[PDB]
Design a protein around this ligand. Structure first.
Ligand code: HEM
Length: 110
């Protein structure tokens, strides 16, 4: 099966490398990027991200609800466009399909 967990790990490496300040909104704020896999807050967040991807592909994802939740953290369209780029890189590095369609669905509610 597609190793979405590995894709997600690379995604966060790309995301926080390009936009380190985004990491301050998370429970693993301040943690060195190279050590995130050993952080409990990160493990939970990564798991939820993997789940969301599998839900988008599976057809059960609630893109409107995820979009609203992000707005509730002052995360909007600009951040998701940046994320779209980081995720494309991560997908490509693992021979996984691009997930732009899934991010676009979230964007349609931002
Ligand atoms: C590919 C793009 C993204 C995906 C698939 C994604 C997915 C998710 C998911 C599934 C959750 C859990 C929501 C829940 O528990 O109901 C979450 C939470 C969150 N996301 Fe994202 N997200 C993305 C982009 C971003 C970006 C660019 C930021 C910028 C800061 C961000 C900030 C947050 C924050 C602060 C939380 C809450 C963390 C917490 O509860 O400790 N997200 N995201």
């Amino acid at each position: 099966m597609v190793n979405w967990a590995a894709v997600v790990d690379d995604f966060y490496q790309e995301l926080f490398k390009a936009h380190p300040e985004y990491q301050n909104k998370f429970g693993f704020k301040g943690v060195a990027l190279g050590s995130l896999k050993g952080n409990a807050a990160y493990k939970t967040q990564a798991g939820k991200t993997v789940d969301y991807i599998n839900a988008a592909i599976g057809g059960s994802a609630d893109a409107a609800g995820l979009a609203s939740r992000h707005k509730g953290r002052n995360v909007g369209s600009a951040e998701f466009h940046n994320a779209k780029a980081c995720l494309a890189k991560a997908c490509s590095a693992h021979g996984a399909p691009d997930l732009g369609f899934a991010i676009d669905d979230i964007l349609s509610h931002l």
